[PDB]
Amino acid sequence: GRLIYTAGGYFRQSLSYLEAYNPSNGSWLRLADLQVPRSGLAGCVVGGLLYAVGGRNNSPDGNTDSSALDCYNPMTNQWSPCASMSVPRNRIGVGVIDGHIYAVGGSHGCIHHSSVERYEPERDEWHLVAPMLTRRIGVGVAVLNRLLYAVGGFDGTNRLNSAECYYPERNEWRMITPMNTIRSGAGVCVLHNCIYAAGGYDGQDQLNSVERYDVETETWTFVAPMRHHRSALGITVHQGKIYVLGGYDGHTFLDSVECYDPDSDTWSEVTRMTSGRSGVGVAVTMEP
Ligand SMILES: CCCC[C@@H]1CCCN1C(=O)[C@H]1CCC[C@@H](c2cccc(-n3ncc(C(=O)O)c3C3CC3)c2)C1
Ligand SMILES: [Cl-]
């Protein structure tokens, strides 16, 4: 069985929680805390291991952007530090290609990064790759067909509808068709042949809308909206369904977990996180 792991997030201050949801029975397990509280991080999985990447500790007595990469082994229920990134990256996005982790964009104080770097677990090493064409924080990242997509975010001045694609073998970024909606701090994932962008902030309002990019048609199409408007949601895929976790609706830090069924084009509530939070990291791996 596989679990949806949520790491970190924010309510009143950045959080250390690691919790695992089992779709097969509705259950939540609390697991070993992160060593350092963090919101605005990303999660990903490589070789069964769960990684927490970047973020920021928003704490009553200091705010510290994170360059940290930390590894959770479900077999041991322990977090281990890995090599740190070149730079702190709060409000980060990440994607895995061929066993390597791409850390994309994010902020360090008022610095809005266009830089991108790549972690190799076998060497425990980060290396910079070509920067994005746009500075992006609160950037959604997805991998489809071994290409890396950076979608929306905030460039230091404007929230963005733009998106771009990284071609590893050319070490080159190129624009793709922009979304139909400006989205910063959305949830971005892949399902079948499409990149989904769910929720986000458009400059004025938290969004419930959801659109998807078909790489063959190069167009974005709206699908059914989520039940909740959400910015800084977590998102993942578990057995062919999109799950969105938490976020902020303009009023409440949501505990709502919703899932999307592409065949009926419907969103439904599936569970509730143990407490409302935004800016979590999310990924899927084996039970611990
Ligand atoms: C410490 C900040 C105060 C608490 C804020 C305001 C009330 C709701 N609240 C949050 O929920 C934040 C909690 C920490 C993580 C943060 C977070 C995560 C990931 C992406 C982004 N991000 N990046 C760009 C933009 C943008 O505005 O364009 C955003 C904002 C829209 C989410 C922000 C959210
Ligand atoms: Cl923040």
Coordinates of C-alpha atoms and ligand atoms in Angstrom, one line a residue:
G1 CA 0.0 0.0 0.0
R2 CA 1.1 3.6 -0.7
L3 CA 0.5 6.6 1.5
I4 CA 0.2 10.3 0.8
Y5 CA 2.8 12.0 3.0
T6 CA 2.4 15.7 4.0
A7 CA 5.4 17.4 5.4
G8 CA 5.6 20.8 7.1
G9 CA 3.3 23.7 6.3
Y10 CA 2.0 26.7 8.2
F11 CA -0.5 27.6 10.8
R12 CA 0.4 30.5 13.1
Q13 CA 4.1 29.5 12.4
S14 CA 5.9 27.0 10.2
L15 CA 5.2 23.4 11.2
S16 CA 7.4 20.2 11.6
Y17 CA 4.5 17.7 11.1
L18 CA 5.0 14.6 9.0
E19 CA 1.7 12.8 8.6
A20 CA 0.7 10.0 6.2
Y21 CA -2.8 9.4 4.8
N22 CA -3.9 5.9 3.5
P23 CA -6.5 6.2 0.8
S24 CA -7.3 2.5 1.2
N25 CA -8.7 2.9 4.8
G26 CA -9.1 6.7 5.5
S27 CA -6.4 6.6 8.3
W28 CA -3.9 9.2 9.2
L29 CA -0.5 8.3 10.9
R30 CA 1.7 10.9 12.6
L31 CA 5.4 10.1 11.9
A32 CA 8.7 11.6 12.8
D33 CA 8.8 15.4 12.9
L34 CA 11.0 17.3 10.5
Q35 CA 14.3 18.4 12.3
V36 CA 13.5 22.0 11.3
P37 CA 10.0 23.5 10.9
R38 CA 9.3 24.6 7.4
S39 CA 6.5 26.0 5.2
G40 CA 6.7 26.7 1.5
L41 CA 8.7 23.5 0.9
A42 CA 8.2 20.8 -1.7
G43 CA 8.1 17.0 -1.4
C44 CA 9.2 14.4 -3.8
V45 CA 10.2 10.7 -3.8
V46 CA 13.3 9.0 -5.2
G47 CA 14.0 5.3 -4.8
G48 CA 11.3 4.9 -2.1
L49 CA 12.7 7.8 0.0
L50 CA 10.8 10.9 0.8
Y51 CA 12.6 14.2 0.4
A52 CA 11.7 17.6 1.8
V53 CA 13.3 20.5 -0.2
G54 CA 13.6 24.2 0.7
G55 CA 10.9 26.3 2.4
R56 CA 11.2 28.8 5.2
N57 CA 10.9 28.6 9.0
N58 CA 8.4 31.4 9.8
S59 CA 8.8 31.4 13.6
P60 CA 7.9 33.9 16.4
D61 CA 11.6 34.7 16.9
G62 CA 13.0 34.6 13.4
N63 CA 12.3 33.8 9.8
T64 CA 14.9 31.7 8.0
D65 CA 14.7 30.6 4.4
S66 CA 15.8 27.0 3.9
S67 CA 18.4 25.6 1.5
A68 CA 18.0 22.2 3.2
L69 CA 17.3 18.9 1.6
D70 CA 16.2 16.2 4.1
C71 CA 15.5 12.6 3.5
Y72 CA 12.9 10.4 5.3
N73 CA 13.2 6.6 5.1
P74 CA 9.8 5.0 5.8
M75 CA 11.6 1.7 6.7
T76 CA 13.2 3.4 9.7
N77 CA 10.9 6.4 10.4
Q78 CA 14.0 8.7 10.5
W79 CA 14.9 11.9 8.8
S80 CA 18.5 12.3 7.6
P81 CA 20.1 15.5 6.3
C82 CA 21.5 15.6 2.8
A83 CA 23.7 18.2 1.0
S84 CA 22.2 21.7 1.0
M85 CA 21.3 23.6 -2.1
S86 CA 23.4 26.4 -3.5
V87 CA 20.9 28.9 -2.1
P88 CA 17.8 29.1 0.2
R89 CA 14.6 28.6 -1.8
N90 CA 11.3 29.4 0.0
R91 CA 8.1 28.8 -2.0
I92 CA 10.0 26.3 -4.1
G93 CA 8.8 23.8 -6.7
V94 CA 10.5 20.5 -7.5
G95 CA 10.4 17.6 -10.0
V96 CA 12.1 14.3 -10.3
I97 CA 13.6 13.1 -13.6
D98 CA 15.6 9.9 -14.0
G99 CA 16.3 9.6 -10.2
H100 CA 17.5 13.3 -9.9
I101 CA 15.7 16.1 -8.1
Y102 CA 15.3 19.5 -9.8
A103 CA 14.9 22.4 -7.4
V104 CA 13.2 25.3 -9.2
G105 CA 12.9 29.0 -8.4
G106 CA 11.7 30.1 -5.0
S107 CA 12.7 33.1 -2.8
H108 CA 15.6 34.2 -0.5
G109 CA 14.4 37.3 1.2
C110 CA 13.5 39.8 -1.6
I111 CA 15.5 37.7 -4.1
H112 CA 13.2 36.0 -6.5
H113 CA 15.2 33.1 -8.2
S114 CA 15.2 32.1 -11.9
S115 CA 18.0 29.6 -10.9
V116 CA 17.5 25.9 -11.0
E117 CA 19.7 23.1 -9.6
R118 CA 19.8 19.3 -9.7
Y119 CA 20.5 16.8 -6.9
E120 CA 22.1 13.4 -7.6
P121 CA 21.3 11.1 -4.6
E122 CA 24.1 8.6 -5.5
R123 CA 26.7 11.4 -5.1
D124 CA 24.8 13.5 -2.5
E125 CA 25.6 16.6 -4.7
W126 CA 23.7 19.6 -6.1
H127 CA 24.7 21.2 -9.4
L128 CA 23.2 24.3 -11.1
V129 CA 21.6 23.8 -14.5
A130 CA 20.4 26.5 -17.0
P131 CA 18.2 29.1 -15.2
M132 CA 14.5 29.6 -16.2
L133 CA 13.7 32.4 -18.5
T134 CA 11.5 34.0 -15.8
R135 CA 12.1 34.5 -12.0
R136 CA 9.4 32.4 -10.3
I137 CA 8.5 31.9 -6.7
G138 CA 5.3 30.0 -5.7
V139 CA 6.0 28.1 -8.9
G140 CA 4.3 24.8 -9.9
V141 CA 6.5 22.1 -11.2
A142 CA 5.6 18.9 -13.0
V143 CA 7.5 16.2 -15.0
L144 CA 5.9 14.6 -18.1
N145 CA 7.7 12.4 -20.6
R146 CA 11.1 13.3 -18.9
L147 CA 10.6 17.0 -19.4
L148 CA 10.3 19.5 -16.6
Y149 CA 7.7 22.2 -16.5
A150 CA 7.6 25.4 -14.4
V151 CA 4.2 26.9 -14.2
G152 CA 3.0 30.3 -13.0
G153 CA 4.3 31.8 -9.8
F154 CA 5.4 35.3 -8.9
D155 CA 8.4 37.1 -10.5
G156 CA 9.0 39.8 -7.8
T157 CA 6.5 42.2 -9.5
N158 CA 3.6 40.3 -11.1
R159 CA 1.9 37.0 -10.6
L160 CA 2.2 34.9 -13.8
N161 CA 0.1 33.0 -16.3
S162 CA 3.3 32.0 -18.2
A163 CA 4.9 28.6 -18.2
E164 CA 8.1 27.1 -19.5
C165 CA 9.7 23.7 -20.2
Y166 CA 13.2 22.4 -19.6
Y167 CA 14.8 20.1 -22.1
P168 CA 17.5 18.2 -20.2
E169 CA 19.6 17.1 -23.1
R170 CA 19.8 20.7 -24.5
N171 CA 20.1 22.2 -20.9
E172 CA 17.6 24.7 -22.3
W173 CA 14.3 26.4 -21.1
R174 CA 11.6 27.4 -23.6
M175 CA 8.2 29.1 -23.1
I176 CA 5.1 27.1 -23.6
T177 CA 1.5 28.3 -24.1
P178 CA 0.5 30.4 -21.1
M179 CA -2.4 29.3 -18.9
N180 CA -5.7 31.0 -19.2
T181 CA -5.4 32.1 -15.5
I182 CA -2.8 33.9 -13.6
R183 CA -1.8 31.5 -10.8
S184 CA 0.8 31.9 -8.0
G185 CA 1.1 29.2 -5.3
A186 CA -1.0 26.8 -7.2
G187 CA -0.8 23.0 -7.1
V188 CA 0.7 21.6 -10.3
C189 CA 0.9 17.8 -11.1
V190 CA 0.7 15.4 -14.0
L191 CA -1.9 12.9 -14.9
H192 CA -1.9 10.9 -18.1
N193 CA -0.7 13.3 -20.9
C194 CA -1.6 16.5 -19.1
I195 CA -0.1 19.1 -16.7
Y196 CA -2.8 20.2 -14.2
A197 CA -2.8 23.6 -12.5
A198 CA -5.2 23.7 -9.6
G199 CA -6.0 26.9 -7.5
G200 CA -3.4 29.5 -6.7
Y201 CA -3.6 33.2 -6.2
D202 CA -4.2 35.6 -9.2
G203 CA -3.3 38.9 -7.6
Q204 CA -6.8 39.5 -6.2
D205 CA -8.3 36.2 -5.1
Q206 CA -7.7 32.6 -4.2
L207 CA -8.8 30.4 -7.1
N208 CA -10.9 27.2 -7.2
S209 CA -10.4 26.9 -11.0
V210 CA -8.4 24.0 -12.5
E211 CA -6.9 23.8 -16.0
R212 CA -4.8 21.3 -17.8
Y213 CA -2.1 21.4 -20.5
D214 CA -2.1 18.7 -23.1
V215 CA 1.5 18.5 -24.4
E216 CA 0.3 17.1 -27.8
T217 CA -2.2 20.0 -28.4
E218 CA -0.2 22.7 -26.6
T219 CA -3.4 24.1 -25.2
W220 CA -4.9 24.6 -21.7
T221 CA -8.5 23.6 -21.0
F222 CA -10.4 24.2 -17.7
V223 CA -11.9 21.2 -16.0
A224 CA -14.3 21.1 -13.0
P225 CA -13.3 23.6 -10.2
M226 CA -12.3 22.4 -6.8
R227 CA -14.9 22.7 -4.0
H228 CA -12.6 25.2 -2.2
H229 CA -10.7 28.2 -3.4
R230 CA -7.0 27.5 -2.3
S231 CA -3.6 29.1 -2.5
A232 CA -0.4 27.3 -1.2
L233 CA -2.1 23.9 -1.5
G234 CA -0.2 20.7 -1.6
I235 CA -1.0 18.3 -4.6
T236 CA -0.1 14.8 -5.6
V237 CA -1.3 11.8 -7.6
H238 CA -2.2 8.5 -6.0
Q239 CA -3.5 5.6 -8.2
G240 CA -4.7 7.8 -11.1
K241 CA -6.4 10.5 -9.0
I242 CA -5.3 14.0 -8.0
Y243 CA -5.4 14.8 -4.3
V244 CA -5.2 18.4 -3.1
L245 CA -4.3 19.1 0.5
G246 CA -4.9 22.2 2.6
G247 CA -4.1 25.7 1.6
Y248 CA -5.6 29.1 2.4
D249 CA -9.0 30.2 1.1
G250 CA -8.7 33.9 2.1
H251 CA -10.3 33.1 5.5
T252 CA -9.3 29.7 6.9
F253 CA -6.2 27.5 6.8
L254 CA -8.0 24.5 5.3
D255 CA -7.9 21.0 6.6
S256 CA -9.9 19.9 3.4
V257 CA -8.4 17.2 1.3
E258 CA -10.2 16.9 -2.1
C259 CA -9.7 14.4 -4.9
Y260 CA -10.3 14.7 -8.6
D261 CA -11.7 11.8 -10.7
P262 CA -10.8 12.6 -14.4
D263 CA -13.3 10.1 -15.8
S264 CA -16.3 11.9 -14.1
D265 CA -14.6 15.3 -14.0
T266 CA -15.7 15.7 -10.4
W267 CA -14.0 16.8 -7.2
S268 CA -15.0 15.2 -3.9
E269 CA -13.9 15.7 -0.3
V270 CA -12.0 12.5 0.8
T271 CA -10.7 13.3 4.2
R272 CA -9.6 16.0 6.5
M273 CA -6.1 16.7 7.6
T274 CA -5.6 16.5 11.4
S275 CA -5.3 20.3 11.4
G276 CA -5.7 23.2 8.9
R277 CA -2.5 24.3 7.3
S278 CA -1.0 25.8 4.0
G279 CA 2.3 25.5 2.2
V280 CA 2.9 21.8 2.8
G281 CA 5.1 19.5 0.9
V282 CA 3.4 16.3 -0.5
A283 CA 4.4 13.1 -2.1
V284 CA 3.6 9.4 -2.3
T285 CA 5.6 6.3 -1.3
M286 CA 5.4 3.0 0.6
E287 CA 3.9 2.6 4.1
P288 CA 6.5 2.9 6.9
Ligands
LIG1 C1 4.1 33.8 6.9 C2 3.1 34.3 5.9 C3 1.8 34.7 6.4 C4 0.7 33.6 6.1 C5 0.1 33.8 4.7 C6 -0.9 35.0 4.6 C7 -2.2 34.4 5.0 C8 -2.2 33.0 4.3 N1 -0.7 32.7 4.3 C9 -0.2 31.5 3.8 O1 -1.0 30.6 3.5 C10 1.3 31.3 3.6 C11 1.9 30.4 4.7 C12 3.4 30.1 4.5 C13 3.6 29.5 3.1 C14 3.1 30.5 2.0 C15 3.3 30.1 0.6 C16 3.6 28.8 0.1 C17 3.8 28.6 -1.2 C18 3.7 29.6 -2.2 C19 3.4 30.9 -1.7 N2 3.3 32.0 -2.6 N3 4.3 32.1 -3.6 C20 3.9 33.2 -4.2 C21 2.7 33.7 -3.8 C22 2.0 34.9 -4.3 O2 1.2 35.5 -3.5 O3 2.1 35.2 -5.5 C23 2.3 32.9 -2.8 C24 1.1 32.9 -1.9 C25 -0.3 32.8 -2.5 C26 0.3 31.7 -1.7 C27 3.2 31.1 -0.4 C28 1.6 30.7 2.3
CL2 CL 6.4 32.5 3.4

